[PDB]
Amino acid sequence: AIQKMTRVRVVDNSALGNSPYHRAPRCIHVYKKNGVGKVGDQILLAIKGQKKKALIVGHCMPGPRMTPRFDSNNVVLIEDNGNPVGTRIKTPIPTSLRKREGEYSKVLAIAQNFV
Template sequence: FFSVHLGRGVSFAHAMETSPQETVSRGFSITGACRAIQKLTRVRVVDNSTLGNTPYHRPPKCIHVYNKTGVGKVGDKILLAIKGEKKKALIVGHKMPGPTMTP
């Protein structure tokens, strides 16, 4: 069997070896796709610049969101770390559905 880390130093293999009276009430935490852009979010570059079109080893990450909340929606400016450079970018799409008839 395999060992899966659940957090706080308890592994799944250790939980299997405990007696039946001792049940572990922890479950697996699976997060869905991010519904907004925040710090350290991996993004996909969708423009025709040479920096955006060249293949990269690590995906570009958002390192700052230029608004009060720190959560970026469509139309907000962000700062990206891409190929060892810092570049300002504009959010043109994400998973969260927005209000009707807004860009």
């Protein structure tokens, strides 16, 4: 449910993601057919005032009944080529996140653990 102007607690090893700023990062737009951004899609991201695409991985809102959920809006950056700009994500990530058909493998290995 990553809607417009949503702040996201990005979990990644990217320096700009790690960079403190005047504000924490917030999204601007998402790659969704509806205006509703769920986990597993491309969203905007402001890193030190820099627009960048990212993938929202792990949300807080209630989704499917059997699935797990964190308490925030976790996300991992993506490059203009689509590759992960950062190195690793400390928080474990849900295994069903790859089951969305699309770009999944490049983030499927880089994080520390699997939730």
